[PDB]
Ligand binder design. Sequence first.
Ligand SMILES: COc1cc(-c2cncc(-c3ccc(C4CCN(C)CC4)cc3)c2C)cc(OC)c1OC
Ligand SMILES: COc1cc(-c2cncc(-c3ccc(C4CCN(C)CC4)cc3)c2C)cc(OC)c1OC
Ligand SMILES: COc1cc(-c2cncc(-c3ccc(C4CCN(C)CC4)cc3)c2C)cc(OC)c1OC
Length: 283
Amino acid sequence: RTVARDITLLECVGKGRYGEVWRGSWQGENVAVKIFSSRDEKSWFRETELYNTVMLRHENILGFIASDMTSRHSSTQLWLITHYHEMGSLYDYLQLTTLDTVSCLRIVLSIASGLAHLHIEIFGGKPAIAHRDLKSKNILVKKNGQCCIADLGLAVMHRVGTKRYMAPEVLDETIQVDCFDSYKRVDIWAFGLVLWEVARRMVSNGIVEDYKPPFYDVVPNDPSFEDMRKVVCVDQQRPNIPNRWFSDPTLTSLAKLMKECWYQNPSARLTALRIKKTLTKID
Ligand SMILES: COc1cc(-c2cncc(-c3ccc(C4CCN(C)CC4)cc3)c2C)cc(OC)c1OC
Ligand SMILES: COc1cc(-c2cncc(-c3ccc(C4CCN(C)CC4)cc3)c2C)cc(OC)c1OC
Ligand SMILES: COc1cc(-c2cncc(-c3ccc(C4CCN(C)CC4)cc3)c2C)cc(OC)c1OC
């Protein structure tokens, strides 16, 4: 039989040190093609090894289609092919969109749902998985108003994470590296920062905050490991909760939830399943 493998690359939608992401076409359908730099080959290998272990299928996880390795004259070409989400990343979306109560809750609950699915061991099933680089650029917006989590290149089953989103135990190197729950608790910290990013863009009483990344007011762009350690570990700063949130019951509840993702003590932080339950009881 015929195995049609040609993908037409149509538009570059992302370029970085990782490599590039392209909108592509296969058999008349959009796909996303991540082309890896040689410097980030281990991210392709880790995502490929994970999907060869467990074929994750979840509405809030970016959908896997293929991993391809192709021999070139003097190099190896590595592609990861996934579902394509034309609305782009949550980071992108929040710059130029504000949210209402329903659309804010739907976004954050969908992220919590994807994260809880990664974290949970299922017997019969899937290993527990920690993401290790959760951030708004690694979350895509779907047309139905839910999101999905992307990029399992650092994931661990039971490159470093983006420094702006690193938990205090990563920055002060006290993380218990042989306890898998440690890695879940690092993801919860990052989730809380994403929850703060999104909540800022929810309108209440005619007020909204501008899009800003976590810690925009206390560290430079491309903050160093030391910059972050001083803020998060030494001074123990946390993102600001504006006064206007305390006039809105949804933002009041989201502020409480953020607080419980940001405890210095990793074992005090909420679990993804508890976050889901709390979000389902808001509004
Ligand atoms: C190798 O490379 C690529 C292949 C494809 C692709 C194209 N047509 C058909 C297929 C196909 C799927 C599944 C079966 C099954 C049928 C039932 N039988 C009992 C076992 C085998 C056969 C064929 C594939 C996998 C797409 C690609 O990219 C989108 C590929 O490149 C990454
Ligand atoms: C990689 O991705 C895509 C693949 C395909 C595709 C192409 N040929 C054949 C298949 C297939 C047929 C049949 C089985 C069998 C397996 C065992 N048993 C006997 C029942 C079912 C499995 C696989 C598929 C899935 C289509 C896609 O989209 C429409 C893909 O997505 C981009
Ligand atoms: C985070 O990581 C990965 C993401 C993706 C991915 C999947 N769907 C869609 C996208 C995308 C599409 C379009 C825009 C723009 C272009 C049009 N307009 C001007 C604004 C919107 C941005 C982004 C991406 C980047 C795939 C990946 O791998 C194949 C990723 O890596 C794991």
